[PDB]
Swiss-Prot record:
InterPro entries: Alpha-catenin/vinculin-like_sf, Vinculin, Vinculin/catenin, Vinculin_CS. One of its GO terms (biological process) is morphogenesis of an epithelium. It comes from Gallus gallus (Chicken). Actin filament (F-actin)-binding protein involved in cell-matrix adhesion and cell-cell adhesion. Regulates cell-surface E-cadherin expression and potentiates mechanosensing by the E-cadherin complex. May also play important roles in cell morphology and locomotion. Residues 955-998, 1072-1086 are annotated as: Facilitates phospholipid membrane insertion. This is Vinculin. Sequence repeats lie at residues 279-389, 390-499, 500-609. The lineage of its organism: Eukaryota, Metazoa, Chordata, Craniata, Vertebrata. The gene is VCL. Its main location: membrane. The modification Phosphotyrosine is found at Y120, Y557, Y842, Y1085.
């Protein structure tokens, strides 16, 4: 190849974008590559038709022509694209892509002519895989470039309205305001329109939701940004004191919209899986932790200030709340920024025990004990401030990453197309600028110091390049030969930078509870790679939620909860030590797999149980507080205490709203829900936190302006936009708790809260009636809401009507506590209080309990059958002779078929070379489908085959033979299986009367047709790259990662179709056709 002595040595410049991923992230791209790879697999199985038999590879002027015919049209506009429209990045990128296309469909007709002439020809079996792969890589890169532009149009339009929200600060005159709407309007419909059209085209749903959610927030925040500018221009007069509550209600609206438009822009440039999501998740979580602390700080800084000793439940559990929530934040840190923060938690954790013991000893004013309570006060300051750090460092570190990305666009347009000017130069100053922010918000000696080196060297080159341009030499064999050298190090910058982001995110776990159990419950497999990591790191954040949950409880339950937390942790730290010994081999570690795997299963039941109570209490009244800020802020007339009363009602509203979100997370964290209802609830919780201040600012603007409507306009727009989050918060929270068990807690709550009305008279208070019917008012109104949700959700008229009935016989029974406790408010007129109050009020609890029974089994009855027929032993005399006049007589014959078996796993190990994640993907689907009989049940049947082929593909990858034709069939079979699962999973859902069960089943099983289509393409590829050429062998190492993470998804997404399919099996229609057989596998059901 190297065509001279001197020059061909330095020239390492075929290096713009020459080792790229394949992409199938749009319906167009998927539709093109699906057949291309279909066609190209033949020629990768014909290339193996000169190995097995070593035989002649037939006439290819028909196959390789229809191959050419496929990607012919694609360049017949792909050349007509590049010269026509003035796209700069399209121009330099479009050709070297389709130079590899035509390279192929040429290089397949050169090697076709080698075998058309000589059907035995190895100079073409040299150049067939190099010729094939080309057309795959080529068209991938060709279709990709074509798309990157369709996106660039959009990010353009978006970046525009990002820049146009800035000019919100330059808007003073009501005259100008409505001309802002005039010229914002048209440029938002085109964005929403551009986005909506683009989402349709997307394969990864994961993405389509982040888009669809983000752009909706944007729409619910014009009605607000519109408002906020009007109450900023309304307040331009000598009578407008608190003028800036508007300005910050208005800049909240501009920041959040801007953080959504940015989230949209980022999500749009996604071509594959998403690694940068997690940093916003954790960043949110710490804001959530900090917030909860911020609230409970002074409520327990007064604990330490005060010598007087109440060491129990009042504001000691206020201090340990902080220390749990700051412990939870430190968890989401990595390295030793984590170890410090948790290190401070266990120090100030024992200093409190030191004190709390000393407070029982009356030692409140002892000179060491006052001093020690001083230390904890200074401790919480430091710990709150050290979490406030790690929090904004994680946001700042990612904001810098998201900032480097949207610039490297035009930074590569400056660095090659050798003019740019001032306009282009700033794009590489800008990226260098951020690399320094990473390094100073990094916390290692050697991690920052390596970046400052890279930054120090791109500094020198970029100064040299800059001055050559300036002293003419901009067009020269030094102005390109160097400016080459830079784009190399400017890629190296994103390495050392992105590596610095990835070193501040720790071994992550499931966001939902039932996920976190699997990641742990999957220590039936005691020895494995990075399950020392994630297997503990779930169990770690499961007990750390048990601990978090017990620290806002009564002392009896509390220690009862921590007793389980500490004995589970103990049986897990046991096999943590036991497994590492040599292996946690079957004998001893069986003893824990009966105790811990069943113990950990009760800790859940104790966490949910409790969580169910804290939701039953806290969510009973979502509105009283902000409904008291309405009547407070309105201010019936004038008593100057108004300000201080509005504060106490506005503080009650912040105290309470903070509680709702803190509980809302606690249900997301520990309950029923999928990852989707958990994420749902969290966005809710994030908006409650954000909006709460924003309402009270508008609620202030009302106190200072008695008579204004424009103030009342902002109140109701904010007041409702906070409710429209809460009513939603409450929708996603009940959905994530057992309804049967919610109705228990709430019945038990109405019982206890009835007594407080019985013994409101027996004590004698007239309002403790009305406060003990603030409960049974909103509580009984909540049990009707919870049943109104379930009837909207069901399609089983037999259930639907039994609960629509027990609803009736309670909705009316709001009388004998509204206009009944209203009558005898003050009265103790014994006969005329209790004759209608207790009588009809305890039949209210009788109705509640009929509503409960409407959920309890409809079809099945109480007494089952025990069949004990004492089989005796009266012997049978069936004596066998053979008769005289005929000959040869016996029972029937035996054909080939068997008795019964079931093909369990070829669990490969002992000096074998496999893909360790791929097998571990395959062994996990098996485990789930292994549970169930495959006998009336092609879904389990399929699932079991799918996970068998995915163990073959695990052994059909590493090293590898001349079995490329095998890897094509293995992945061909896997696709065909998956299509059966999808066939059946749809028929199940279609028969299922529970809509949340149905919908969440279609959502996990409609992933599978695409995922398997991709797995086919990746399999047709990697085949072509199976131990071949030397430059090939650094692509064939990164190209597994895609296929690996693509196999992980299929096994996971099929595993959840199996479960949800069985789930949706149970609640099936009355006269329903399709039903598969769900029977757990026993010794007696194989
Ligand atoms: O290898 P692919 O992934 O493309 O699989 C295609 C599928 O339609 C598959 O179901 C096969 O169905 P088929 O019904 O054509 O099976 C062959 C048989 O009828 C006579 O030998 C195709 O052979 C097969 O298409 P083909 O006709 O190009 O071989």
């Amino acid at each position: 190849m190297g065509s001279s002595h001197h020059h061909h040595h330095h020239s390492s410049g075929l290096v713009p974008r020459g080792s790229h991923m394949p992409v199938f992230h749009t319906r167009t791209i998927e539709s093109i590559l699906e057949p291309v790879a279909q066609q190209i697999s033949h020629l990768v199985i014909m290339h193996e038709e000169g190995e097995v038999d070593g035989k002649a590879i037939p006439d290819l002027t028909a196959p390789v022509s229809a191959v050419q015919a496929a990607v012919s049209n694609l360049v017949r506009v792909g050349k007509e694209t590049v010269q026509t429209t003035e796209d700069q990045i399209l121009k330099r990128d479009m050709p070297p892509a389709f130079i590899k296309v035509e390279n192929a469909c040429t290089k397949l007709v050169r090697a076709a002519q080698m075998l058309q002439a000589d059907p035995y020809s190895v100079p073409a079996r040299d150049y067939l895989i190099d010729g094939s792969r080309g057309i795959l890589s080529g068209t991938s890169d060709l279709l990709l470039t074509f798309d990157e532009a369709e996106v660039r149009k959009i990010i353009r339009v978006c970046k525009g309205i990002l820049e146009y929200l800035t000019v919100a600060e330059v808007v003073e005159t009501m005259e100008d305001l409505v001309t802002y709407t005039k010229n914002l309007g048209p440029g938002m419909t085109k964005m929403a329109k551009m986005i909506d059209e683009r989402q349709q085209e997307l394969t990864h749903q994961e993405h389509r939701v982040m888009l669809v959610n983000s752009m909706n927030t944007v729409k619910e925040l014009l009605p607000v940004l519109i408002s906020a500018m009007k109450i900023f221009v309304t307040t331009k007069n000598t009578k407008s004191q608190g003028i800036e509550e508007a300005l910050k209600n208005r800049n909240f609206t501009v920041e959040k919209m801007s953080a959504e438009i940015n989230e949209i822009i980022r999500v749009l440039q996604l071509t594959s899986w998403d690694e940068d999501a997690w940093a916003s998740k954790d960043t949110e979580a710490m804001k959530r932790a900090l917030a909860l602390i911020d609230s409970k700080m002074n409520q327990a800084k007064g604990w330490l200030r005060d010598p007087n000793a109440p060491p129990g439940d009042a504001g000691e559990q206020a201090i340990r709340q902080i220390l749990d929530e700051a412990g939870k934040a430190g968890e989401l840190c990595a390295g030793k920024e984590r170890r410090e923060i948790l290190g401070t938690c266990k120090t100030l954790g024992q200093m409190t025990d030191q004190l709390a013991d000393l407070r029982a000893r009356g030692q409140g004013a002892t000179p060491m004990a006052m001093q020690k309570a001083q230390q904890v006060s200074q401790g919480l300051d430091l710990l709150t401030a050290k979490v406030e750090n790690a929090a904004r460092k994680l946001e700042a570190m990612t904001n810098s990453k998201q900032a480097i990305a949207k610039k490297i666009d035009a930074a590569q347009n400056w660095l090659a197309d050798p003019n740019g000017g001032s306009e282009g130069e700033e794009h590489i100053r800008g990226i260098m600028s951020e690399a320094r922010k990473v390094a100073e918000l990094c916390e290692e000696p050697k991690e920052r110091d390596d970046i400052l080196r890279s930054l120090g060297e791109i500094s020198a080159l970029t100064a040299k390049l800059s001055d050559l341009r300036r002293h003419g030499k901009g067009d020269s064999p030094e102005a390109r030969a160097l400016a080459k050298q830079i784009a190399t190090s400017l890629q190296n910058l994103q390495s050392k930078t992105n590596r610095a982001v990835a070193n501040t995110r720790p071994v992550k776990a499931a966001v939902h509870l039932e996920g976190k159990i699997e990641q742990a419950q999957r220590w039936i497999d005691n020895p494995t790679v990075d399950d020392r990591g994630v297997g503990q790191a779930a169990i770690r954040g499961l007990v750390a939620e048990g601990r978090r949950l017990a620290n806002v409880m009564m002392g009896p339950y509390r220690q009862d909860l921590l007793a389980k937390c500490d004995r589970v942790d103990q049986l897990a730290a046991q096999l943590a030590d036991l497994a590492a010994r040599g292996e946690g081999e079957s004998p001893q570690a069986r003893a824990i797999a009966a105790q811990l795997q069943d113990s950990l299963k009760d800790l859940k039941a104790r966490m949910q149980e409790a969580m169910t109570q804290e939701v039953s209490d806290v969510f009973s009244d979502t509105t009283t507080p902000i409904k008291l800020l309405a009547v407070a802020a309105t201010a019936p007339s004038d008593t100057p205490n108004r300000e201080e009363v509005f504060e106490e009602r506005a503080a009650n509203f912040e105290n309470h709203a903070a509680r709702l979100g803190a509980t809302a997370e606690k249900a997301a964290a520990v309950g029923t829900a999928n990852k989707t209802t958990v994420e749902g609830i969290q966005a809710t919780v994030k908006s409650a936190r954000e909006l709460t201040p924003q309402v009270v600012s508008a609620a202030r603007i009302l106190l200072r302006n008695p008579g204004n409507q424009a103030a009342y306009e902002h109140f109701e727009t904010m007041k409702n936009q906070w409710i429209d989050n809460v009513e939603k918060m409450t929708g996603l929270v009940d959905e994530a708790i057992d309804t049967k068990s919610l109705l228990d807690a709430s019945e038990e709550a109405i019982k206890k809260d009835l007594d407080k009305c019985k013994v409101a008279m027996a004590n004698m208070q007239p309002q403790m009636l009305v406060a003990g019917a603030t409960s049974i008012a909103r509580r009984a109104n909540r049990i009707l809401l919870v049943a109104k949700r379930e009837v909207e959700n069901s399609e089983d008229p037999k259930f639907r009507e039994a609960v629509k009935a027990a609803s009736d016989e309670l909705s009316k029974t709001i009388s004998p506590m509204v206009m009944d406790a209203k009558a005898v408010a003050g009265n103790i007129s014994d006969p005329g209080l209790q004759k209608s109050f207790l009588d009809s009020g305890y039949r209210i609890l009788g109705a509640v309990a009929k509503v409960r029974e409407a959920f309890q089994p409809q079809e099945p009855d109480f007494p089952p059958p025990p069949p004990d027929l004492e089989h005796l032993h009266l012997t049978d005399e069936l004596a066998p002779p053979k008769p005289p006049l005929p000959e040869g007589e016996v029972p029937p014959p035996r054909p080939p078929p068997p008795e019964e078996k079931d093909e369990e796993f070829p669990e490969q190990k002992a000096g074998e070379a496999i893909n360790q994640p791929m097998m571990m993907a395959a062994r996990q689907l098996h485990d789930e489908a292994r549970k169930w009989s495959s006998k009336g049940n092609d879904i389990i049947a399929a699932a079991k085959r799918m996970a068998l082929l995915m163990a073959e593909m695990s052994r059909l990858v590493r090293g590898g033979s001349g079995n490329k034709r095998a890897l094509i069939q293995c992945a061909k079979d896997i696709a065909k299986a998956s299509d059966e699962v999808t066939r059946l999973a749809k028929e199940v859902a279609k028969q299922c009367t529970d809509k949340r069960i149905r919908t969440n089943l279609l959502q996990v099983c409609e992933r599978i047709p695409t995922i398997s289509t991709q797995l086919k393409i990746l399999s047709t590829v990697k085949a072509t790259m199976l131990g071949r050429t030397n430059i090939s062998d650094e692509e064939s190492e990164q190209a597994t990662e895609m296929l690996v993470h693509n196999a992980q998804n299929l096994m996971q997404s099929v595993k959840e179709t199996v479960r949800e399919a069985e789930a949706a099996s149970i609640k099936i229609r009355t006269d329903a056709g399709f039903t598969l057989r769900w029977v757990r596998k026993t010794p007696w059901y194989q």
